[PDB]
Amino acid sequence: GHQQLYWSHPRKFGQGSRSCRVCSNRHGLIRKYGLNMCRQCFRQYAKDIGFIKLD
Template identity: 70%
Template sequence: MGHSNVWNSHPKNYGPGSRVCRVCANPHGLIRKYGLMCCRQCFRSNAKDIGFIKILAPQQFGTRVKFLIARVS
C-alpha cells in the first residue's frame, strides 16, 4: 500500500480540518461563535446583513477607543 493510498483515506469528522467557512469554504480564520461558521474575511463583508453592528467601547487605561461588534437581537 503506497503513501498516496493512505493519505487522506479517512474523512475528517473532528478537529480544525473538518470545519470550513460556509460562504467561501476557507478553513482558516473561522469564527464559530453563535454558530456562524464563517471566516473572518467573509464576516467583515457580511456583518451588517447578518445583524451585527459596531459600538464604541469605553476608553480604558488611556488607550485609544476600540470598536466592538455586537449582535442586534
C-alpha cells in the first residue's frame, strides 16, 4: 500500500517497538542499564562489555 497505511500502525510502545540491537529479535530483551540486547546475545558478548562472573 501507499504511505498512508504501510507503517500506519502505532509502535510507540509495547514489545513490537523494541528489538535486539544485535540480532533484531523481539524476545528476551535486556533493557536494564539501557542494554537493549537479546538474552542470548548478552551471554555471547558479556565478556566484551565487562559483565564477568564472580559468584
